[PDB]
Structures are given as structure tokens and as C-alpha cells.
Amino acid sequence: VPRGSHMIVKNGEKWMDRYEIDSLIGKGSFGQVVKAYDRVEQEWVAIKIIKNKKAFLNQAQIEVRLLELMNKHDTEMKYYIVHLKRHFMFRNHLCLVFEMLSYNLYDLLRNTNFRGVSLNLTRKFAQQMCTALLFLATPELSIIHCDLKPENILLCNPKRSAIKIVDFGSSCQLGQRIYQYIQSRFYRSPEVLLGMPYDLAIDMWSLGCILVEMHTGEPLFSGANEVDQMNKIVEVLGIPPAHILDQAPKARKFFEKLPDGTWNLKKTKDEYKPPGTRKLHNILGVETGGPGGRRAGESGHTVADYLKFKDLILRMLDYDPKTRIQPYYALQHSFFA
Numbered sequence: 308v309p310r311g312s313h314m315i316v317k318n319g320e321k322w323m324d325r326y327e328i329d330s331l332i333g334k335g336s337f338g339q340v341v342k343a344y345d346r347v348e349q350e351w352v353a354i355k356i357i358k359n360k361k362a363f364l365n366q367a368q369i370e371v372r373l374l375e376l377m378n379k380h381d382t383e384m385k386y387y388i389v390h391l392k393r394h395f396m397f398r399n400h401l402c403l404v405f406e407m408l409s410y411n412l413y414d415l416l417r418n419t420n421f422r423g424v425s426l427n428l429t430r431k432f433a434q435q436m437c438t439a440l441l442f443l444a445t446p447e448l449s450i451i452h453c454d455l456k457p458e459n460i461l462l463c464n465p466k467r468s469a470i471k472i473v474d475f476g477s478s479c480q481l482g483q484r485i486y487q488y489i490q491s492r493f494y495r496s497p498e499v500l501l502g503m504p505y506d507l508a509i510d511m512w513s514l515g516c517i518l519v520e521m522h523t524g525e526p527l528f529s530g531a532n533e534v535d536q537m538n539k540i541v542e543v544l545g546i547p548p549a550h551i552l553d554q555a556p557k558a559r560k561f562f563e564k565l566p567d568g569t570w571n572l573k574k575t576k577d578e579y580k581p582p583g584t585r586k587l588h589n590i591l592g593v594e595t596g597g598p599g600g601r602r603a604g605e606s607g608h609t610v611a612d613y614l615k616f617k618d619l620i621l622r623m624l625d626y627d628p629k630t631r632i633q634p635y636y637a638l639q640h641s642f643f644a
């Protein structure tokens with residue numbers, strides 16, 4: 308019995324007279340992902356190999372149950388979610404066989420030297436992500452991904468705009484509270500930072516953050532820790548509404564209630580732009596040629612196009628999860644007309 312939790316996988320070995328192991332795609336907390344040729348089906352697959360560790364086996368069983376639930380649906384909207392072909396035990400590890408995709412949206416931004424992709428390509432990603440979130444919001448699914456980020460959105464083909472969401476390992480269904488901290492910090496909603504109840508609206512928050520980053524090349528809210536994160540959110544969006552902070556278990560981690568009942572930022576131990584003064588209108592360069600002025604004298608980047616993009620993003624970054632724009636209504640926005 309091996310001492311380590313990982314599977315030993317040798318490039319070029321063949322599993323079960325079927326899978327020809329090519330190479331390592333990625334390592335993660337869960338285990339590893341290997342590129343393999345399925346000689347039976349004559350196609351590339353990505354095999355996600357789960358560590359022999361109880362916590363990761365449990366996350367992976369949730370992942371399998373949620374992906375299989377999604378597969379029973381007929382709608383074309385299910386094809387924005389990575390397809391689980393099958394799963395098996397091999398050398399005492401749970402192995403999930405996925406369709407093979409191309410590189411992730413972070414890799415795409417790196418290939419721009421972090422100058423961002425066009426507003427036209429951003430629009431195509433936005434429309435597909437809003438469709439994927441509408442699918443997850445189907446009542447019988449009610450799935451919260453809980454870890455949307457550029458690294459978890461993959462292109463199907465390196466020369467095309469089609470994308471899929473991957474990695475439902477941290478996912479849950481509406482009403483569940485499983486993990487103490489959720490979402491990647493730069494993409495983490497205010498309700499999660501505040502220790503408030505969370506629903507599918509946390510994934511729309513993440514999507515808003517992602518789409519700005521895809522066009523500017525830089526994360527909207529690049530916090531070094533939860534306090535720095537909330538402070539970067541407040542630079543752009545102002546102090547959250549009182550009706551939210553008055554109910555937030557962790558309001559006093561970031562804010563302080565003054566004698567008159569109004570909320571301000573908490574005093575530091577002893578630097579940010581004043582609340583609401585880092586305007587998204589200027590981050591996007593709506594009137595000034597887009598990010599860094601670089602989109603002036605290119606088509607598809609008009610002031611009208613930028614106002615529609617800014618307006619949709621600010622509806623996705625509503626502090627109030629009850630009023631934040633829902634996928635069904637985001638798809639009807641004039642940005643997609």
C-alpha cells in the first residue's frame with residue numbers, strides 16, 4: 308500500500324488496455340489531471356485522478372453526482388459545462404474521464420501580455436457564461452459553482468471563442484453550507500466576505516469580476532487578504548448598504564457603525580482611494596479609448612458599446628444579492644442585442 312496520497316503515473320504507460328497516458332495537464336489540491344488517448348473511443352480525454360484522501364474523495368463524489376445530474380438534461384445550455392464521460396477506480400484512486408478541452412482564460416490573457424481581449428470576444432464569453440449560469444439555476448439543479456475564475460473557464464478549441472466551465476469540486480446546491488471559506492479571493496462576493504447567506508448570485512458576482520479582467524487584462528479586485536479584498540471592492544463600489552451591514556455577522560471585520568447609525572471603513576492598525584471614487588467608467592476607459600486608451604481607432608469599441616458593458620457589469624456587482632442581475636435577465640441586456 309503506497310505511503311503517499313498521489314497516484315504514480317508514468318508518461319507513455321497504458322491503463323486497462325485503453326488509456327495511453329501522454330502528459331500532465333495540471334496538479335491541484337485534489338490530485339492531478341493527465342492528458343490521455345482513449346484508444347477504444349479514438350479521442351483525447353483529460354483524466355482527473357483524485358488523491359487517496361477522504362476529504363478529496365468526498366469533494367469528487369459531490370462533483371460526480373452534480374455532473375451526472377446535469378447530464379440527464381436535454382437543453383443545449385448543458386454544453387457550456389465540461390462533459391464527464393465516465394468514472395472508475397484504478398490503483399485505488401477515483402478517476403474522472405472528461406472531454407479534452409484547450410487552455411483556460413488566464414492562459415488567454417497571458418498570451419495578450421495582460422492587455423486584455425477585445426470587447427467583441429468579452430461579449431461572446433459573457434453570453435456563454437450567462438447561459439451556463441441560467442442552466443445551473445434550473446430548479447432541479449440549483450448548483451452554485453463556488454469557484455468561478457479565469458482558470459476554471461476553458462476554450463473548447465484554441466482558435467474559437469466556445470468555452471466551458473470546469474471543476475465542480477467546491478460546488479454545492481442552494482441552501483447548503485459545506486465549506487468554511489468559499490470562492491477564490493479575487494472573485495469572492497461581498498456576502499461571503501461578510502459571512503452572510505449565499506445563493507447562486509455569488510457566481511454572478513464572480514462573472515462580473517472575470518469579464519472586467521478579460522477586457523482590461525488585470526483583476527478588478529486583487530486583494531492580498533480578505534480585508535484588502537473588501538477595501539478594493541469599496542474603492543470601486545462605495546460602502547455597502549446599511550440594510551446589508553446591519554445583518555452581516557462579519558461587518559465589524561471591515562466596517563464600523565458610527566454614533567448616527569451610518570457605516571464607515573474600520574480604522575487601520577497604522578492608503579485606499581476614498582469609497583466609490585475608483586469608478587468602473589474610468590477603469591474600462593468608456594470615454595477615453597478603452598483600457599489604457601488602446602481600443603481607440605479599433606472598431607467594436609464605441610462609447611455606446613462601453614456604456615452597455617459597464618451597465619451590465621455594475622448590475623452583476625450589485626452589493627445586494629436579492630437585486631443583483633440574474634442570468635435570465637442578464638441574457639436580455641442590450642450588451643447582447
Ligand SMILES: Nc1nc2[nH]ccc2c(=O)[nH]1
Pocket residue numbers: 332333340353389405406407408409410461473
Ligand atoms: N485541457 C483540459 N481539459 C480538461 N477537461 C476537464 C478538465 C480539464 C483540464 O483541467 N484541462
